[PDB]
């Protein structure tokens, strides 16, 4: 019974929450998606010059 | 005795990752401000103009 | 049960040591940010000129 | 056998998955060189005041 309540524990974490993982550096990455747009007014400042 | 100091390693050095996942959390996180802080001389562009 | 121990203390480490000192990389990223952040600041002064 | 299997498992895992922890680790701190430079070419606009 304590190594089976290991085993839900083992997989309580390394089961789940490396694949809800994500949160972090996947929803990570959508920063460049919304750095990335600082190019969209980039340019507009070159038009003006 | 080797059930027991598997135990002991994650119960330390699995439990790690949770604990020093702070560290990349927070100094991840805080590239926000550090960055932001453009903004502070973005306003002293526009005041130029 | 003994070999994974000892392999999951390694682990320890060898996860322990990227997330910490590319925490300080995060922070390497802030001070490559304040960078920017200082010659965003000679913009306007010359600017201002 | 499972004990075993189960032991082997997460020693290779934890050998893998939070020391890959290096992959977004890595990845995500040299984000610091290649948005830096944007103030190698920050330079280029005062001179261009």
Redesign the interface.
């Given at each position: 019974a304590a190594?089976s309540a290991?085993?839900i524990g083992?997989a309580g974490?390394?089961s789940q929450?490396?694949v809800v993982g994500e949160a972090?550096?996947g929803l990570?990455a959508i920063i460049d998606a919304l750095t990335m747009k600082i190019d969209e007014d980039a340019r507009p400042a070159v038009g003006s010059f």
């Open positions: 190594v290991l085993a083992t974490l390394l929450v490396p972090m550096g990570g």
